[PDB]
Design a protein around this ligand. Structure first.
Ligand SMILES: Nc1ncnc2c1ncn2[C@@H]1O[C@H](COP(=O)(O)OP(=O)(O)OP(=O)(O)O)[C@@H](O)[C@H]1O
Ligand SMILES: Nc1ncnc2c1ncn2[C@@H]1O[C@H](COP(=O)(O)OP(=O)(O)OP(=O)(O)O)[C@@H](O)[C@H]1O
Ligand SMILES: Nc1ncnc2c1ncn2[C@@H]1O[C@H](COP(=O)(O)OP(=O)(O)O)[C@@H](O)[C@H]1O
Ligand SMILES: Nc1ncnc2c1ncn2[C@@H]1O[C@H](COP(=O)(O)OP(=O)(O)O)[C@@H](O)[C@H]1O
Lengths: 259, 262, 260, 125, 119, 241, 264, 241
């Protein structure tokens, strides 16, 4: 949930008002008289903590909710992809007010080059199944979309405009110390650790990190000690762990490849 | 539905649409007296977020004819040789109601240029609507049916579609001028509030020709920078704030220092 | 429904279909006098906007025989084994209704190379292309039913059926020359006023790389373009603005100007 | 998602660009950082080194090198295409400018020579 | 797709592949050696595997004393190694006759490595 | 099978698709303009990039020089452009020391173009993608202005341009030009075009450079003036951007 | 049944009637048996139980006999998904199969996977045919999200067997799961008689013992070698209709059949 | 197929391809007509009126003489035409040097074809995308003659011939009018013969033409823009209706 998430002090706010506030408070939007937004987009590299935030929103929405990752769309028999896509948006407006989540679209949301194939030509019209729905003759005022991607600079601009994605949001990089101190305190505090607590010795390091690697180090450090016929606590000799979270050394193609 | 007061931004284009649509229906007698032809459907190309689909929902509000729609790729189908059946069972539903406009929002999924290594049923059902528009029985269908299609970039397609005889006009929806950009603010603002001592042309002239739909984004967003603070009313500096922002990121990835040339 | 006296241009092209279809019903004693029987088959190349379908519907106006209506995609079916029956149906009934004609159009939908695919549906057309062959020349003669097939591109398509036994002449069309643009223009314009400005032998001219179909758009696009000026009849400069428009995005010789 | 024109470097695409020089630069990124600043009285150059095996005497290698007493250089990219480049460079400082003008080159008439060592690579396939 | 059967082609991600195959083609002998310095000296060992029983073991050797005060221990298959040890036994005439004295090791590696760069 | 993999192949349609794929490269390049008029020739420029931490101030990019008489403007690739001018600067001097006088401008381009033809057929080699402008003065023909093309054919123009969006810029030049302009009619003309068909709204002094030829040498031959920034930031404000 | 055996959780092959290892098998004892035995600690720490493992190395090691065997000790359902036999030329339908099994595994209450030759997933992508290689990640990437989504179960374990480790470098998929990656051995010369003691049992052969077997087993250190030598050495005592083995047939067997096990 | 992407292989019909694809390039070029009277030769051109920015001080010129008794005209593309013109005039002045004697026209014509034969035979080379023709008089005689050349490397001797756009209209035309039963005598009918021949292409533009003729005794003479403008009218003067 929200409290289970660490340092999203900024990003956490924009969606819990772009999703929850309207259905709870919409008369005040039109008390001005404007149309609120419909779509957003969450672009940042992996492990930066995006796919889990919606799962927090899933716990607290009091609406419907749908999970479709981008690879689920395609099949071998053409024509059925889009009707599956049409089956979605009709299901949404039916069980309204509802919203939708996608965990990846870079297999779909692309630049629409000049195709000369069936594969590269059939993927495109899938994308067209979205555009003719998200803004065509038949639209509505209950659906909202939560896109997602590990990166967003290639998917076509025709998808990127207002009416479609009124509020897209960034994510931090992996070298920003403030939240790093906030995550270790978060994750570690959820369980019981040692008094010898050299965690203000690890944050200071220059290394770049995600929210995913942190789940690795603090778990596999919880592995080595629990493996020691012990009961709870994790010894301050987890120096194995941090250095065990050095995957660049485990990449010979990052060791003896270009030279 | 929406209406023609809302599609402001132009008149030259829209004043060319019912040059072909409204006249033959209401008044063919002069055109039968003059008795020359019958100009059939139309295409309108332009970049996205410009008002293509918008004009096409309005016109239905101001037509008096029946107005059939097909959204993106609801004709391409799984089994074989019934996509065509899904077509020829369309037009027969039109001729029942002799005045019948149709509409298909996008064709670049269907009507892309043909090849042999791939592209099957879709390059077939295109190869019979292309018959239905101007064939023997198409001459029968050619009486009163009118067509509108709204692509994004037309070089992709065949010429046979946009070949005249069936496509007699090819309209451009370019991104606007200052006064065009300036007005549609009001068309997306008049609901708002008694905006306080404000100009809106001094800000349009700031934002050079980007698109139209973007302007719907600044206005809705500007109120939102006023919505947070329980400031129901609207500011000036919130506008040139937002428009100066939301296009920055659009001008963020355009840079590159490859420079293998000069 | 249309007739002759509505084309003017195609003369080198039109004498054949006359020799295939319109004539032999009249004076077959010509062909036998030599000891000869006319073609069983015709085809028409593409180069669109040049009057292919127009020609076929003309002869239907005066043929004194049974005439048919097919586009290439009505043949195909869904149940995977009923398509090719349908072809034998239309040919036997034509014999029952002989002397008869057919017209299969845009058959690039059907006619393709033996692509040797892996789909499961694209096979059931190749068989459907094949009973035709086995029907049309095949094993046994069929009588006096004639084919007038059409297309828009053939330079890599229509593999094997294009041969004698099945088709005998290959008329081709292109965008006309200067000489034909003269008389063809008189066709459409022979109901309007043409107040005094005619000058037509400079209006149309070479380097107007246009079609034989766009002209009627130019003809009709002008009249209303004059109507909106509250002037029903027409002048020259009505047409000048039109030709300025419709020609605009046909071609661009930016890669030319090198062969100095 | 590129094809049929990065195969070589002597076929202009319709878009009008050469094949794989754009892709050589892709490694230049993937090498270590570097920098240099112009002051009003001097100039600086600097690089780190992520020496793979710590057992290496890191002093032996030198990212930086000499060209003259007055000129110095550094890269950010592939290694072994540097330590030959310099000998191919300072050999040119002598035979080109020095022995027909007496003294050492300025920087740009020493950099222009480096380029003519480079373009001779992108001449053929 | 190309990109692999030729040397002088970069991949679009930057890394070429053909040398990386040669970096991998060293250990077809399943041999592992070791070197270590001293206070005034240095030593090199080398594992041996002569499974068949008809090889005079004295001549099988991945060692080539190229000249005075130089040594070399190789990996990779033997024939390519001789094709390198020769060039070492050639330069040590030249650097002596051309510049006067014996080659240090560091130059001899710097020189030899430029040759394998040119390929 | 399409006919582009080598420049030694005619197409069945009778054309050499590789060469067109070079003449399109200059479209990526930066604008260049020249005007021919009474007193002397003028040129312009526009750098492709105008960022902060690189000095285009003293470092000319688009306007090299070939002799005190002749100066050029350059486009396209940069590595395949220097060697041309470093050939032209040789051929001229190798025309001087033998004939003891200056170069006629027509011979240079005739000799500089027919080598680009040499890199069009004989060998599987790249054609040099470059579109020079030539500006200079010879006595047998007075003032002169030529233009090149990486095929190898030239043309003696009056006032033209190349680079990004020249097709529109010509339309801004075809109809609003007068042969009797002295100098500054061409200047406010020239600088007005680049102001219209640019990429961004800066028009900063760094973004562009000018040059001139002038017969103002009173019975002496000729002068040049390649303007420093202080001579061109003062003129546009003196002209009304 | 449709797909695989599933072992009915009790078909009790001997994980110790084998000449394998004690360290590795005890390394696996941690990640599987300890929680399913003893949840009182992972609960006490709150760490979720582990996420799968890799077992590299080429065959002969027995890197599939232990797997279903220890699964038989705990009693889960053992199945297959050989990636060589999962790829399908069509655009989708390589990912559908992934989606069936994570679902169908959960149709059963416990279930564990044995993927093999998974390099078919983890390819270097040297061809770079974007019509294909854009899809290769598409089906692969679906695995990453189909595998650890909402599944908070302690029953659905994962295994991936991968000969040729590190051939994959499109993505090493390191962070998070794969809580072990066992340093697999080969059959040491000491383990030979540890292995020959296995298959030799259930025979009346006058012993058939020797120390000339590991020398024969030298470089033929693969379990199939010993399975087959005991096979064909069994076929030579009957070559003359004898009654019991002689150990010379073993010294004959491994010497004369590891030939194919060393040249091809 | 694949038989057409080189110069050193034969299709199974026996004929090479890259050569006669050149004949498709030359078809894309301008006209070039020539006629011989009884004692004088003429030559034409489909000059263009492109735009009002080429210097009227220097009109272009297809024609290019090599010596005072020989000329040359071509069509196709100009770059590959510039070379052999320079290898020609070089070769002629050598024949004056070595032999103290001018060139028989047949000897010249076999030198230009003697290069169009090697530039297709030995690969590593592209042909000359040009057809040409020769015109003039032999020394010490009035014998008129013109020869044609084409990139296959063969030389013929027509009496009238053309190359390029709508040549097919013309080569049939002169057959309907020109004939050896009545060979013309002097200029004003060879020109009155020719200026009408161009008209299939010229579409009534007289800023789109040039012309030359030939002398005995090693001379030539060019021609004006009004000196045709009357001939624009006598040819139209017959066209009263
Ligand atoms: N000039 C305008 N007048 C009114 N609305 C406009 C105008 N320009 C943009 N819009 C807004 O932009 C949206 C329409 O986008 P547009 O129709 O240009 O894209 P589209 O044609 O629907 O894209 P596609 O049809 O390719 O999916 C609407 O929300 C509309 O309110
Ligand atoms: N000589 C002519 N007189 C009148 N109209 C002509 C003439 N030639 C062509 N046309 C026009 O061309 C159109 C027919 O084009 P065409 O015959 O190519 O159609 P088609 O057979 O379906 O082929 P396509 O699919 O390429 O259009 C007609 O609508 C007609 O107006
Ligand atoms: N702030 C955080 N606290 C704890 N775990 C985090 C945090 N951010 C990310 N993670 C971990 O990273 C994973 C999410 O990866 P993510 O970047 O969302 O991949 P994707 O977006 O492709 O699904 C989660 O499983 C979670 O364990
Ligand atoms: N450690 C071992 N001890 C005894 N037999 C073994 C051992 N390892 C493998 N085997 C034999 O080899 C077979 C297993 O082959 P294996 O190497 O697991 O194939 P894969 O590696 O493809 O799973 C078993 O039937 C067994 O008889």
């Amino acid at each position: 949930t929200y409290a289970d998430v660490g340092g999203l002090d900024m990003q956490k706010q924009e969606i819990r008002e772009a999703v929850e506030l309207p259905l709870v408070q919409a008369d005040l939007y039109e008390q001005i008289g404007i149309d609120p937004p419909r779509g957003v987009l969450l672009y940042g590299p992996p492990g930066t903590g995006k796919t889990m935030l919606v799962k927090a929103v899933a716990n607290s929405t009091k609406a419907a909710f749908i999970r479709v990752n981008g690879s689920e769309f395609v099949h071998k028999y053409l024509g059925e992809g889009p009707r599956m896509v049409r089956d979605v948006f009709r299901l949404a407006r039916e069980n309204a007010p509802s919203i939708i989540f996608i965990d990846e679209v870079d297999s779909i949301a692309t630049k629409r080059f000049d195709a000369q194939t069936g594969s590269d030509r059939e993927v495109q019209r899938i994308l067209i199944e979205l555009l003719t729905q998200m803004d065509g003759f038949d639209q509505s005022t209950n659906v909202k979309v939560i896109m997602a991607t590990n990166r967003a600079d290639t998917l076509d601009p025709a998808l990127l405009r207002p009416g479609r994605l009124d509020r897209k949001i960034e994510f931090p990089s992996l070298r920003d110390r403030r939240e790093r101190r906030l995550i270790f305190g978060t994750i570690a505090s959820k369980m019981s650790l040692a008094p010898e607590a050299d965690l203000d010795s690890l944050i200071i390091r220059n290394d770049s990190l995600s929210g995913a690697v942190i789940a690795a180090i603090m778990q596999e450090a919880g592995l080595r000690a629990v493996r020691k016929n012990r009961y709870v606590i994790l010894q301050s000799d987890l120096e194995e762990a941090y250095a065990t979270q050095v995957k660049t050394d485990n990449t010979v193609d990052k060791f003896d490849f270009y030279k | 539905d929406s209406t023609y007061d809302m599609v402001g931004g132009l008149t030259k284009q829209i004043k060319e649409i019912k040059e072909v649509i409204e006249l033959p229906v209401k008044h063919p007698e002069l055109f039968e007296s003059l008795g020359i032809a019958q100009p059939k459907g139309v295409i309108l190309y332009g970049p996205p977020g410009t008002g293509k689909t918008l004009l096409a929902r309005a016109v239905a509000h101001h037509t008096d004819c029946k107005f059939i729609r097909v959204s993106g790729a609801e004709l391409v189908q799984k089994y074989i040789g019934e996509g065509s059946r899904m077509v020829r069972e369309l037009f027969v539903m039109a001729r029942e109601h002799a005045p019948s406009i149709i509409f298909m929002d996008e064709i670049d999924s269907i009507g892309s240029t043909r090849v042999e290594g791939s592209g099957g049923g879709d390059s077939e059902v295109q190869r019979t609507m292309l018959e239905l528009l101007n064939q023997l029985d198409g001459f029968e269908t050619s009486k009163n049916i009118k067509i509108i299609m709204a692509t994004n970039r037309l070089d992709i397609l065949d010429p046979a579609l946009l070949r005249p005889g069936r496509i007699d006009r090819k309209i451009e929806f370019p991104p606007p001028s200052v006064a065009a950009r300036a007005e549609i603010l009001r068309i997306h603002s008049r609901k708002m509030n008694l905006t306080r001592g404000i100009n809106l042309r001094k800000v349009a002239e700031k934002m050079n020709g980007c698109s139209g739909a973007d302007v719907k984004g600044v206005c809705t967003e500007a109120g939102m920078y006023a919505l947070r603070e329980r400031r129901i009313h609207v500011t000036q500096e919130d506008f040139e704030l937002a428009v100066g922002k939301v296009m920055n990121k659009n001008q963020e990835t355009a840079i590159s220092v490859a420079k293998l040339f000069k | 429904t249309e007739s002759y006296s509505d084309i003017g241009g195609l003369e080198s092209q039109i004498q054949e279909i006359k020799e295939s279809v319109e004539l032999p019903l009249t004076h077959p004693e010509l062909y036998e006098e030599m000891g000869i029987k006319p073609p069983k088959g015709v085809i028409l190349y593409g180069a669109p906007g040049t009057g292919k379908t127009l020609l076929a519907k003309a002869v239907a106006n005066q043929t004194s025989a049974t005439f048919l209506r097919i586009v290439g995609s009505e043949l195909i079916q869904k149940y995977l084994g009923d398509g090719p029956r349908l072809c034998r149906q239309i040919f036997k009934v034509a014999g029952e209704n002989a002397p008869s004609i057919v017209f299969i159009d845009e058959i690039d939908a059907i006619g393709t190379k033996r692509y040797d695919s892996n789909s499961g549906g694209e096979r059931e057309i190749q068989r459907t292309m094949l009973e035709l062959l086995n029907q049309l020349d095949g094993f046994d003669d069929r009588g006096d039913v004639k084919v007038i097939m059409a297309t828009n591109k053939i330079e890599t398509l229509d593999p094997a059926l294009i041969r004698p036994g099945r088709i005998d002449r290959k008329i081709l069309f292109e965008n006309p020359d200067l000489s034909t643009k003269k008389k063809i223009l008189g066709i459409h314009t022979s109901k309007m006023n043409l107040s005094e400005d005619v000058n037509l032998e400079t209006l149309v001219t070479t380097k107007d790389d246009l079609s034989g179909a766009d002209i009627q758009a130019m003809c009709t696009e002008a009249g209303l373009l004059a109507l909106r000026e509250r002037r029903m009849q027409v002048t020259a400069e009505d047409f000048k603005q039109a030709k300025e428009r419709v020609m605009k995005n046909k071609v661009e010789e930016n890669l030319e100007g090198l062969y100095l | 998602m590129t094809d049929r024109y990065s195969f070589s470097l002597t076929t202009f695409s319709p878009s009008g660009k050469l094949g794989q020089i754009d892709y050589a630069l892709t490694a230049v990124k993937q090498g270590v950082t570097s920098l240099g600043i112009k002051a009003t009285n001097g100039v600086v150059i600097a690089t780190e080194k992520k020496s793979s095996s710590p057992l290496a005497m890191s002093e032996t290698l030198s990212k930086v090198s000499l060209l003259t007493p007055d000129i110095g250089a550094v890269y950010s990219g592939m290694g072994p295409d540097y330590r030959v480049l310099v000998d191919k460079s300072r050999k040119v400082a002598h035979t080109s400018y020095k022995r027909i003008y007496g003294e050492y080159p300025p920087t740009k008439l020493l950099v222009s020579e480096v380029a003519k060592i480079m373009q001779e690579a992108t001449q053929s396939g | 797709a190309g990109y692999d059967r030729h040397i002088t082609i970069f991949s679009p991600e930057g890394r070429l592949y053909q040398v990386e195959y040669a970096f991998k083609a060293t250990n077809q002998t399943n041999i592992n050696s070791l070197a270590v310095r001293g206070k005034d000296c240095t030593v090199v060992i080398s594992q041996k595997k002569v499974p068949d029983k008809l090889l005079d073991p004295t001549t099988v050797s991945y060692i080539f004393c190229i000249s005075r005060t130089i040594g070399m221990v190789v990996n990779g298959p033997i024939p390519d190694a001789r094709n390198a040890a020769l060039r070492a036994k050639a330069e040590a005439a030249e650097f002596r006759y051309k510049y006067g004295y014996d080659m240090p090791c560091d130059v001899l590696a710097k020189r030899m490595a430029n040759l394998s760069q040119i390929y | 099978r399409r006919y582009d993999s080598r420049t030694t192949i005619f197409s069945p349609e009778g054309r050499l698709y590789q060469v067109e794929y070079a003449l399109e490269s200059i479209s990526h390049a930066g604008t260049a303009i020249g005007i021919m008029a009474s007193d002397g020739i003028v040129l312009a420029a526009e750098r492709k990039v105008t960022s902060t931490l690189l000095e285009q101030d003293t470092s000319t990019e688009k306007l090299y020089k070939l002799n005190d008489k002749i100066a050029v403007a350059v486009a396209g690739l940069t590595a395949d452009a220097e060697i041309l001018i470093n050939t032209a600067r040789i051929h001229a001097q190798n025309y001087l020391k033998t004939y003891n006088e200056d170069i006629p401008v027509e011979i240079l381009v005739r000799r500089l173009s027919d080598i680009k033809q040499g890199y069009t057929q004989h060998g599987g080699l790249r054609p040099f993608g470059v579109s020079f402008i030539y500006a200079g003065y010879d006595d047998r023909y007075g003032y002169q202005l030529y233009t090149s093309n990486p095929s190898g054919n030239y043309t003696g123009w009056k006032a033209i341009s190349v680079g990004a969006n020249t097709s529109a810029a010509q339309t801004l030049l075809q109809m609003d030009y007068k042969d009797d302009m002295k100098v500054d009619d061409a200047i406010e003309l020239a600088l007005k075009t680049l102001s219209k068909t640019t990429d961004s709204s800066a028009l900063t002094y760094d973004r562009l450079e000018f040059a001139t030829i002038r017969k103002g040498a009173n019975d002496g031959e000729v002068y040049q003036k390649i303007f420093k920034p202080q001579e061109i930031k003062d003129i546009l404000v003196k002209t009304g951007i | 049944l449709v797909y695989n055996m599933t072992s009915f959780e009790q078909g009790e092959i001997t994980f110790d009637g084998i000449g394998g290892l004690t360290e590795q098998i005890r390394e696996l004892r941690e990640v599987i048996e300890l929680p399913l035995k003893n949840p009182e600690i992972f609960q006490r720490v709150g760490i979720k139980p582990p996420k799968g493992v890799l077992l590299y190395g080429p065959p002969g090691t027995g890197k599939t006999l232990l797997a279903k065997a220890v699964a038989a000790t705990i009693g889960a359902n053992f199945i297959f998904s050989p990636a060589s036999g999962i790829v399908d030329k069509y655009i989708g339908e390589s990912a559908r199969i992934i989606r069936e099994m994570f679902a169908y595994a959960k149709e059963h209450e416990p279930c564990i996977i044995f993927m093999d030759e998974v390099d078919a997933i983890g390819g270097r992508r040297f061809s770079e045919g974007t019509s294909a290689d854009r899809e290769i990640q598409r089906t692969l990437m679906e695995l990453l999200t189909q595998m650890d989504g909402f599944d908070n179960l302690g029953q659905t374990k994962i295994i991936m067997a991968t000969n040729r480790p590190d051939t994959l470098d499109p993505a090493l998929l390191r962070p998070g799961r794969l809580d072990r990656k066992v340093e697999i051995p080969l059959p040491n010369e000491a383990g030979r008689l540890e292995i020959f003691k296995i298959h030799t049992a259930k025979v009346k052969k006058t012993g058939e013992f020797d120390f000339e077997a590991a020398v024969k087993m030298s470089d033929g250190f693969n379990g199939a070698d010993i399975r087959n030598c005991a096979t064909e050495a069994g076929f030579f005592a009957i070559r003359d209709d004898r009654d019991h083995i002689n150990p010379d047939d073993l010294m004959k067997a491994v010497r004369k059949v590891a030939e194919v096990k060393k040249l091809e | 197929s694949g038989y057409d992407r080189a110069l050193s292989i034969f299709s199974p019909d026996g004929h090479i391809f890259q050569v006669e694809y050149a004949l498709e390039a030359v078809k894309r070029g301008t006209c070039a007509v020539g006629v011989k009277g009884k004692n004088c030769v003429v030559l034409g051109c489909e000059r263009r009126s492109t735009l009002k920015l080429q210097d009227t001080r220097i009109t272009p010129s297809k024609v290019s003489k090599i010596d005072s008794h020989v000329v040359l005209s071509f069509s196709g593309l100009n770059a590959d035409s510039r070379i052999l013109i320079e290898k020609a005039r070089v070769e002629a002045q050598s024949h004056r040097l070595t032999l103290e004697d001018p060139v028989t026209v047949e000897y010249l014509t076999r030198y230009v074809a003697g290069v169009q034969q090697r530039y297709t035979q030995s690969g590593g080379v592209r042909p000359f995308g040009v057809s040409t023709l020769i015109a003039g008089f032999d020394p010490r005689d009035d014998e008129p003659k013109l020869y044609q050349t084409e990139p296959s490397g063969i030389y013929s001797s027509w009496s009238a011939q053309t190359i390029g756009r709508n040549s097919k209209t013309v080569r049939e035309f002169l057959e309907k009018n020109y004939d050896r039963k009545e060979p013309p005598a002097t200029v004003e009918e060879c020109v009155k013969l020719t200026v009408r021949s161009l008209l299939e292409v010229v579409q009534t533009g007289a800023k789109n033409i040039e012309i030359t003729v030939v002398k005995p005794d090693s001379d030539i003479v060019a021609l004006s823009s009004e000196e045709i403008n009357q001939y624009v009218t006598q040819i139209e003067q017959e066209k009263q209706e």
